[PDB]
Enzyme design. Sequence first.
Site, PDB file in Angstrom:
ATOM      1  N   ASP A 163       0.717  -0.931  -0.064  1.00  6.14           N
ATOM      2  CA  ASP A 163      -0.126   0.042  -0.165  1.00  6.14           C
ATOM      3  C   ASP A 163       0.820   1.438  -0.124  1.00  6.14           C
ATOM      4  O   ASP A 163       0.464   2.048   0.144  1.00  6.14           O
ATOM      5  CB  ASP A 163      -0.895  -0.218   1.319  1.00  6.14           C
ATOM      6  CG  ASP A 163      -0.814   0.007   1.856  1.00  6.14           C
ATOM      7  OD1 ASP A 163       0.716   0.682   2.729  1.00  6.14           O
ATOM      8  OD2 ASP A 163      -1.312  -0.397   3.771  1.00  6.14           O
ATOM      9  N   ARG A 191       0.784   6.861  -0.261  1.00  7.47           N
ATOM     10  CA  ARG A 191      -0.315   5.556   1.193  1.00  7.47           C
ATOM     11  C   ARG A 191      -1.414   5.840  -0.189  1.00  7.47           C
ATOM     12  O   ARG A 191      -1.897   7.052   0.030  1.00  7.47           O
ATOM     13  CB  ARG A 191      -0.629   6.532   1.884  1.00  7.47           C
ATOM     14  CG  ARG A 191      -0.994   5.326   2.968  1.00  7.47           C
ATOM     15  CD  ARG A 191      -0.366   3.689   3.425  1.00  7.47           C
ATOM     16  NE  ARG A 191      -0.591   3.213   4.251  1.00  7.47           N
ATOM     17  CZ  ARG A 191      -2.561   2.344   4.441  1.00  7.47           C
ATOM     18  NH1 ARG A 191      -3.342   2.648   3.014  1.00  7.47           N
ATOM     19  NH2 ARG A 191      -2.667   1.805   5.384  1.00  7.47           N
ATOM     20  N   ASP A 219      -6.164  -1.057   3.279  1.00  8.58           N
ATOM     21  CA  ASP A 219      -5.094  -1.635   4.368  1.00  8.58           C
ATOM     22  C   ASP A 219      -4.210  -3.174   4.106  1.00  8.58           C
ATOM     23  O   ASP A 219      -4.808  -4.034   3.652  1.00  8.58           O
ATOM     24  CB  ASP A 219      -4.815  -1.425   6.025  1.00  8.58           C
ATOM     25  CG  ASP A 219      -4.085  -2.139   7.226  1.00  8.58           C
ATOM     26  OD1 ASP A 219      -3.009  -1.041   6.676  1.00  8.58           O
ATOM     27  OD2 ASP A 219      -4.561  -2.216   8.013  1.00  8.58           O
ATOM     28  N   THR A 220      -3.172  -2.815   4.048  1.00  8.38           N
ATOM     29  CA  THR A 220      -2.371  -3.845   3.138  1.00  8.38           C
ATOM     30  C   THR A 220      -1.495  -4.396   4.415  1.00  8.38           C
ATOM     31  O   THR A 220      -1.392  -3.692   5.469  1.00  8.38           O
ATOM     32  CB  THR A 220      -1.559  -4.270   2.388  1.00  8.38           C
ATOM     33  OG1 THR A 220      -0.507  -2.888   2.303  1.00  8.38           O
ATOM     34  CG2 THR A 220      -2.473  -4.042   0.953  1.00  8.38           C
ATOM     35  N   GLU A 235       1.601  -5.736   6.380  1.00 10.05           N
ATOM     36  CA  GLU A 235       3.118  -5.414   6.159  1.00 10.05           C
ATOM     37  C   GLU A 235       3.562  -6.383   6.261  1.00 10.05           C
ATOM     38  O   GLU A 235       3.897  -7.852   5.841  1.00 10.05           O
ATOM     39  CB  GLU A 235       3.860  -5.342   7.650  1.00 10.05           C
ATOM     40  CG  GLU A 235       2.398  -4.302   8.363  1.00 10.05           C
ATOM     41  CD  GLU A 235       2.570  -2.321   7.639  1.00 10.05           C
ATOM     42  OE1 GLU A 235       4.150  -1.939   7.414  1.00 10.05           O
ATOM     43  OE2 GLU A 235       1.688  -1.788   7.701  1.00 10.05           O
ATOM     44  N   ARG A 276       3.519  11.314   3.659  1.00 11.95           N
ATOM     45  CA  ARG A 276       2.807  10.762   2.551  1.00 11.95           C
ATOM     46  C   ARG A 276       1.348  11.697   1.492  1.00 11.95           C
ATOM     47  O   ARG A 276       1.313  11.981   2.331  1.00 11.95           O
ATOM     48  CB  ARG A 276       3.201   9.329   2.557  1.00 11.95           C
ATOM     49  CG  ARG A 276       4.343   8.566   3.718  1.00 11.95           C
ATOM     50  CD  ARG A 276       3.333   7.109   4.279  1.00 11.95           C
ATOM     51  NE  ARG A 276       1.786   7.020   4.971  1.00 11.95           N
ATOM     52  CZ  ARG A 276       1.921   5.782   5.808  1.00 11.95           C
ATOM     53  NH1 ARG A 276       2.868   4.513   5.563  1.00 11.95           N
ATOM     54  NH2 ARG A 276       0.628   5.945   6.409  1.00 11.95           N
TER      55      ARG A 276
END
EC number: 3.1.31.1
Length: 129
Positions: free
Chosen positions: A15, A29, A34-35, A37, A75
């Site tokens: 992401d 971002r 939300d991917t 980690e 970001r």
Amino acid sequence: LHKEPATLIKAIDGDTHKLMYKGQPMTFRLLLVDTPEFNEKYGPEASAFTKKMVENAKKIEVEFDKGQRTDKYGRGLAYIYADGKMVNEALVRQGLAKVAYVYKGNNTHEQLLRKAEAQAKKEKLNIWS
Ligand SMILES: Cc1cn([C@H]2C[C@H](OP(=O)(O)O)[C@@H](COP(=O)(O)O)O2)c(=O)[nH]c1=O
Ligand SMILES: [Ca+2]
């Protein structure tokens, strides 16, 4: 909303990635997702999916929403398209990100994304398996 140009500088993960936008390097971002980690389950698969989708595209574009364009870490906050296909949506459709981080006034594509998530869930894809 409208699309603007950018170019890829470097993949980072599912992401985030580094793009050149208005001729400056910026880490973006992805909005509304939300991917995992990299060190988490499906993280490597997410990072691969995003990297492939953007590196293979002839045309990368950035679409800001109506609200803040940068987050507290500096970001860029956007929807990213690769040859007209939104990455944020495609990640969720494939069960490699959750709809997340839906902040008032930067949620234009919320329902579009939620619909993808529903189909990914119906299909028990990846995260939803
Ligand atoms: C996606 C997004 C994240 N963020 C912030 C919230 C989270 O803060 P915290 O770092 O305090 O948890 C963080 C999560 O991003 P990551 O998923 O990249 O960690 O980025 C925003 O402020 N606006 C957004 O649109
Ligand atoms: Ca993440």
